[PDB]
Amino acid sequence: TELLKPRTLADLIRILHELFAGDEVNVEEVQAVLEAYESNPAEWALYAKFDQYRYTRNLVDQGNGKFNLMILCWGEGHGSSIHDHTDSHCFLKLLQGNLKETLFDWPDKKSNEMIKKSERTLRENQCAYINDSIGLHRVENVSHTEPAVSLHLYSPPFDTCHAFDQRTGHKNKVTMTFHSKFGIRTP
Ligand SMILES: [Fe+2]
């Protein structure tokens, strides 16, 4: 063990490599380390590539295959589907701005409105955690004036998930794409 405060994004990545050296994941330790990194915009500007129309996913590190670390850039009003995480751990840390997270239960096979179980505002530097056992969520930048930037870690990596129709609970498979990888736009 001996978790130390990451001094920089680079230092955080190094620490994460250590924490994912094995086949299991200490969720509380990973969350603690992510939370302890104090966002420094100069360190992640390279990855903070926005799109006018929707949020972008910008790959930072491939975690020697154990995890993907990426930065998501949310324009004003940009948000996600209600989605799962494909049997992976998902950590979400705010680097800039605020995001609203809404939780949903897994739908029953009957077609019904998905009612929100709860919501919270994730603030700068806070780190949230979700997995399929916890439930489903939507993440949204509700701000009209401030873009948000978040750092996401998923283990194992996954590039598909399901989006859920809020009116019915019906799910559709979605393939996730990257806007950039290692600072390089990937069209
Ligand atoms: Fe998510």
For residue 47, give the 3-state DSSP assignment.
helix
149 CA from centroid of ligand 1 (Å): 14
- The dihedral region occupied by 34, where left means phi > 0, alpha psi between -120 and 50, and beta the remainder, is alpha
160 CA from centroid of ligand 1 (Å): 12
Beta strand 56-61 pairing with 180-181: parallel
Single-letter amino acid code for the residue at 13: I
Q: Which residues contact 28 (CB under 8 A, 6 or more apart)?
A: none
Residue 4 CB-half CA count within 13 A: 8
49 CA from centroid of ligand 1 (Å): 19
44 CA from centroid of ligand 1 (Å): 21
* Resolution reading in Å: 1.6
156 CA from centroid of ligand 1 (Å): 14
Domain boundaries, the chain: 1-187
8 CA from centroid of ligand 1 (Å): 25
152 a known binding residue?
A: no
* Cα–Cα distance measured from residue 81 to residue 77, given in angstroms and rounded to the nearest whole number: 13
User: Furthest-apart CA pair in the chain: how many Å?
Assistant: 49
Q: Which residues contact 141 (CB under 8 A, 6 or more apart)?
A: 55, 74, 75, 76, 77, 78, 79, 97, 98, 99, 100, 147, 148
* Cα–Cα distance measured from residue 18 to residue 100, given in angstroms and rounded to the nearest whole number: 31
The answer to whether 166 and 108 are in contact (CB under 8 A) is no
- The alpha-carbon radius of gyration of the chain (Å, integer) is 16
Q: Which residues contact 24 (CB under 8 A, 6 or more apart)?
A: none
83 a known binding residue?
A: yes
138 CA from centroid of ligand 1 (Å): 7
What contacts 24+ positions apart, CB below 8 Å, involve 155-159? Answer: 155/20, 155/25, 155/63, 155/66, 155/67, 155/68, 155/88, 155/89, 156/66, 156/67, 156/88, 157/62, 157/63, 157/65, 157/66, 157/67, 157/68, 157/88, 158/85, 158/86, 158/87, 158/88
> By what technique were these coordinates determined?
X-ray
17 CA from centroid of ligand 1 (Å): 22
The answer to whether 154 and 67 are in contact (CB under 8 A) is yes
* Cα–Cα distance measured from residue 89 to residue 74, given in angstroms and rounded to the nearest whole number: 21
The answer to whether 181 and 61 are in contact (CB under 8 A) is no
* Cα–Cα distance measured from residue 181 to residue 57, given in angstroms and rounded to the nearest whole number: 9
1-187 in CATH: which number? 2.60.120.10
Q: Which tokens in the block code for residue 80?
A: 């996600």
56 CA from centroid of ligand 1 (Å): 13
* Cα–Cα distance measured from residue 35 to residue 150, given in angstroms and rounded to the nearest whole number: 12
* Cα–Cα distance measured from residue 23 to residue 111, given in angstroms and rounded to the nearest whole number: 38
